[PDB]
């Protein structure tokens, strides 16, 4: 914790160093896509690989 | 399902049969005044993407299987689920001590081996 610090608190052993932040908070894209918040407003999915 | 090959003859380098210094491996003719590049009548054919074979039957042997190079018993066990699509091919540098154990293992797995009788004899 002193070598690397935290994403909000500076590292003790590295002057003015903070841990990098992420472009996504939660990196489980399946959890976002298959969530109740998102799946409740998507239109009815067409079929998978369609018949010829 | 039958394997169709658009062509069986290889594409030889132009003028490769007149000189030993020029190998058979295909080289694109860069000459502008070359009859082979301009594709006259009687000139040899060139590798075109039209000759490409069916995607489904690509890499398939005439028996319908795809070759899978195997160096030990661990490689041949991977084909437990894919024994109807792939054939085991023991590498050329695998010794006869391991070739026999690969062939016996591939027998129980129900896997065809393309070179199963190499560097060994039989004793009934």
């Amino acid at each position: 914790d002193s070598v690397f610090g935290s994403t909000t608190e500076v590292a003790q052993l590295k002057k003015n160093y903070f841990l990098p932040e992420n472009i996504i908070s939660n990196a489980d894209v399946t959890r976002l896509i298959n969530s109740d918040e998102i799946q409740s407003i998507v239109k009815a999915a067409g079929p998978s690989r369609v018949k010829r | 399902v039958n394997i169709i090959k658009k062509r069986t003859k290889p594409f030889k380098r132009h003028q490769s049969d007149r000189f030993k210094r020029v190998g058979e491996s295909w080289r694109k003719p860069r000459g502008i005044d070359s009859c082979v590049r301009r594709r006259f009548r009687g000139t040899i054919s060139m590798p075109k993407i039209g000759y490409g074979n069916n995607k489904k039957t690509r890499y398939c042997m005439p028996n319908g299987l795809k070759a899978f190079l195997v160096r030990n018993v661990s490689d041949v066990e991977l084909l437990l689920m894919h024994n109807k699509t792939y054939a085991a091919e023991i590498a050329g540098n695998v010794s006869a001590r391991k070739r026999v154990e690969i062939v016996e293992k591939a027998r129980a797995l129900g896997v065809k081996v393309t070179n199963a009788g190499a560097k060994v004899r039989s004793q009934e």
């Binding site: 298959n34 109740d36 799946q39 009815a44 | -």
Partner: protein
């Protein structure tokens, strides 16, 4: 004693039921509309 049928499954089955209801109703009226259309 028994596993309780995960709540994601219950949410999906409710959603699929709504869509299945719509599909039958759409095809139910489509067959009537198609039969009249063919006569026209």
């Amino acid at each position: 004693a028994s596993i309780f049928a995960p709540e994601s499954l219950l949410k999906k089955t409710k959603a699929q039921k709504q869509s299945r209801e719509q599909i039958v109703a759409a095809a139910a009226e489509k067959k009537s509309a198609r039969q009249k259309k063919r006569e026209l």
